Amino acid sequence: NTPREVTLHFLRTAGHPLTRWALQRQPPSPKQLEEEFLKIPSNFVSPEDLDIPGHASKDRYKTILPNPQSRVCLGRAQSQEDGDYINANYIRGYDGKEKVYIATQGPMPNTVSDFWEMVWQEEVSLIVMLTQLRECVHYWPTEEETYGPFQIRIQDMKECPEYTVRQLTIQYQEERRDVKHILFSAWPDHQTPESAGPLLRLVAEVEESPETAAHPGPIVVHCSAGIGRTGCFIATRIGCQQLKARGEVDILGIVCQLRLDRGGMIQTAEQYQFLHHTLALYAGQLPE
């Protein structure tokens, strides 16, 4: 068995189910969580695994690449652009449900049009942006701007204590669609949010979003590299979904499935511990 077969086998089979009680009252120790986290393979892809010439100019980081198996490919239905490349992966949701999310990096100035093409092509109606104040381009308009063939307009902007909700529209030719955009700041790279409460309110904000499509598109979740904060946010939502539906959560299993979808999701052991903390808090909100 090669290193890749070893990696795939661990990720497909590792798990550590935690009842609601154990999570709240007897969680794994900080030492055990550190060692568990260290054992999770990254599933990073080597540049030799992508044959996409020119892709490097569209990557924020040379080592953080989209796994080819779940890579979002741009079909260019609406444009004349060369190739199909965006650093973005489809991510499975609760119970392995396909294409619940797209994890991607924040657009670079040269990939803003690619980003909007992706939002059109995938029928995205919700974007979750994770950032901190001192940081990440402003790829949405102040009033109205055109990006490639798309006209984007801001219909509303509402500040909540912990995030800003923008209501946008994107139009191509005759067709105009709503996109809800949530900007959650106060989340530094390689760190955790200040506390779990604002993160759980972000997760609730997402749940409450209007879902009027027959086949809902993926939710776009992004941050600088598209893996640490994105992975934490997606893992928290799936964790909450498991706790609510089954009264238990397998956080190890969750992170392992996310790494199958995009290498490196959840960057630090501190972030991993914070996921336990967050889910313990959510557990107490759940009905008896």
- The CATH number assigned to the domain holding 100 equals 3.90.190.10
Q: Is 71 annotated as a binding residue?
A: no
User: Among residues 136, 223, 240, 256, which one is catalytic?
Assistant: 223
Instruction: Give per-residue burial for 166-204: e unless 16+ CB within 10 Å, then b.
Output: bebebebeeeebebbbbbbbebbeeebbeebebbbebbe
Residue 126 is encoded by which pair of tokens?
Answer: 């919700």
Residue 89: HSE in the Cβ half-sphere, 13 Å Cα cutoff = 27
Strand partners, 146: 151
Q: What are residue 49's phi and psi, to 5 degrees?
A: -85, -15
Q: What is the span of the domain harbouring residue 15?
A: 1-288
- 223 annotated active-site: yes
Q: Is 227 annotated as a binding residue?
A: yes
**Number of domains present in the structure of the chain:** 1
Q: Is 209 annotated as a binding residue?
A: no
Question: Are the CB atoms for 199 and 193 separated by under 8 Å?
Answer: yes
